[PDB]
Amino acid sequence: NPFQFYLTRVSGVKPKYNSGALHIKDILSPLFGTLVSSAQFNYCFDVDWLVKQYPPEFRKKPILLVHGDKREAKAHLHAQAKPYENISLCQAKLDIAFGTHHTKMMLLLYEEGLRVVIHTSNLIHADWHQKTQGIWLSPLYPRIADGTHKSGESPTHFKADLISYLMAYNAPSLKEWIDVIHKHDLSETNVYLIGSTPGRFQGSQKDNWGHFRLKKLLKDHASSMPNAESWPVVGQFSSVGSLGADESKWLCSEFKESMLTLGKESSSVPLYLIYPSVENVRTSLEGYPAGGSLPYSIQTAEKQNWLHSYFHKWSAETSGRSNAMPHIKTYMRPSPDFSKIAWFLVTSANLSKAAWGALEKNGTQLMIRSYELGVLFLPSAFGLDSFKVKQKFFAGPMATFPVPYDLPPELYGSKDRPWIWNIPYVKAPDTHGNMWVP
Ligand SMILES: O=C(O)c1c[nH]c2c(-c3ccccc3)cccc2c1=O
Numbered sequence: 232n233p234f235q236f237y238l239t240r241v242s243g244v245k246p247k248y249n250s251g252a253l254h255i256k257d258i259l260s261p262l263f264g265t266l267v268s269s270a271q272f273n274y275c276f277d278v279d280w281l282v283k284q285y286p287p288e289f290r291k292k293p294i295l296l297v298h299g300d301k302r303e304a305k306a307h308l309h310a311q312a313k314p315y316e317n318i319s320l321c322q323a324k325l326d327i328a329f330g331t332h333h334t335k336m337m338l339l340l341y342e343e344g345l346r347v348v349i350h351t352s353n354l355i356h357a358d359w360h361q362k363t364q365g366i367w368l369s370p371l372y373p374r375i376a377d378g379t380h381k382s383g384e385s386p387t388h389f390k391a392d393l394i395s396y397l398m399a400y401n402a403p404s405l406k407e408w409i410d411v412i413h414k415h416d417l418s419e420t421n422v423y424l425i426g427s428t429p430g431r432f433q434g435s436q437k438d439n440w441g442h443f444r445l446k447k448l449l450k451d452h453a454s455s456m457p458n459a460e461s462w463p464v465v466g467q468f469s470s471v472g473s474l475g476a477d478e479s480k481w482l483c484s485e486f487k488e489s490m491l492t493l494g495k496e497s498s499s500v501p502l503y504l505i506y507p508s509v510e511n512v513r514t515s516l517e518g519y520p521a522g523g524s525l526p527y528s529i530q531t532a533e534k535q536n537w538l539h540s541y542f543h544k545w546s547a548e549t550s551g552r553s554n555a556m557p558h559i560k561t562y563m564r565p566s567p568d569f570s571k572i573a574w575f576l577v578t579s580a581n582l583s584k585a586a587w588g589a590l591e592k593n594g595t596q597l598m599i600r601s602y603e604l605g606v607l608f609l610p611s612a613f614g615l616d617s618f619k620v621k622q623k624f625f626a627g628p629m630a631t632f633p634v635p636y637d638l639p640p641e642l643y644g645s646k647d648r649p650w651i652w653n654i655p656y657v658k659a660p661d662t663h664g665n666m667w668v669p
Pocket residue numbers: 274275333352353523524525526
């Protein structure tokens with residue numbers, strides 16, 4: 232395969248459903264490269280656990296943890312890392328209220344080159360145990376010879392775009408990583424970077440981030456087809472923000488409008504949202520505790536009951552993961568019969584204005600609260616007009632894209648409810664025999 236899109240290993244499925252999956256120990260193995268230094272961008276860290284995932288011979292190499300924690304949470308993280316003299320920390324600035332550092336990325340510097348890993352898992356045991364999570368693995372990027380002057384840039388502009396993302400932090404520890412990236416050849420990269428960074432962007436900067444970044448890439452590098460209006464949009468996520476009193480406020484006015492962009496020319500497009508029902512969580516491998524990582528609050532939900540008529544169950548027989556609750560987030564554009572897709576995005580971004588941006592100041596400014604990161608797969612970047620959907624995620628032309636859940640998505644039944652994490656479920660017990668009492 233040219234796509235290098237993986238799922239994490241799931242404890243409890245048959246071996247055939249983990250053949251081709253990756254655990255964090257696999258990613259950090261010496262088979263991938265001889266580690267010199269690494270940077271771990273994430274939201275939540277268990278530092279004792281994380282160091283144990285590195286190979287023993289690499290556990291004293293420098294590690295930088297890039298996080299967004301403040302005040303007592305910041306102190307707690309520093310306390311976790313103090314026993315490890317080789318670990319440094321970088322607090323990403325969050326100057327807009329209610330923002331978080333959600334980006335999940337590894338920079339892995341080797342003797343042999345550099346690797347970039349953009350993924351969806353927190354650095355804690357539970358996120359790699361029984362969840363559905365996504366990983367994109369970059370090629371091994373070779374170093375540019377000292378004295379040679381080459382750009383090292385890809386046709387997707389990935390090198391410049393990754394440097395731009397890191398520059399937004401304005402952090403000394405990340406200037407060091409920017410200099411590392413400048414020294415490597417990333418020309419083989421076949422994905423586009425889609426990032427969010429906190430701020431208020433107008434003018435030339437409007438298209439740099441968030442859903443306007445996605446819109447710009449789809450305008451420039453995808454083609455519109457006849458009957459495009461019949462190609463649905465699918466969004467699949469693990470959390471939902473406050474989207475407003477009706478769909479016209481944000482979901483179907485600016486978010487969907489960016490997502491349905493194709494080509495440079497100038498809505499009844501079906502919108503499918505995939506989000507675990509209560510029954511999905513109850514019967515999952517983890518049981519109700521899986522809902523601890525699906526943080527949809529009742530306060531938000533009760534203000535937007537209109538949204539739930541868009542919701543479809545989690546189903547993933549194609550990858551044997553129907554009972555492995557999703558923490559991956561994906562967005563894609565399938566054909567009307569779900570046999571092809573016009574593009575696929577894997578990202579940290581949930582269905583929220585904080586992650587994707589919301590227009591302000593009479594439509595002239597995009598305000599984003601959070602850091603997010605994902606990679607976009609476009610057929611044009613692979614010499615194709617569309618991707619055929621792989622029918623079985625782990626089965627065997629390698630130009631078919633491995634969609635990790637079932638299509639078409641299945642609408643909630645009349646008795647289904649979206650998982651809401653801060654109310655009790657006492658009607659029926661989970662796979663471990665327990666109820667849920669927040
Ligand atoms: O990395 C990620 O995707 C995650 C980000 N926030 C999470 C929260 C949370 C939500 C609101 C306020 C504080 C915490 C709770 C449970 C899991 C997550 C989580 O998994």
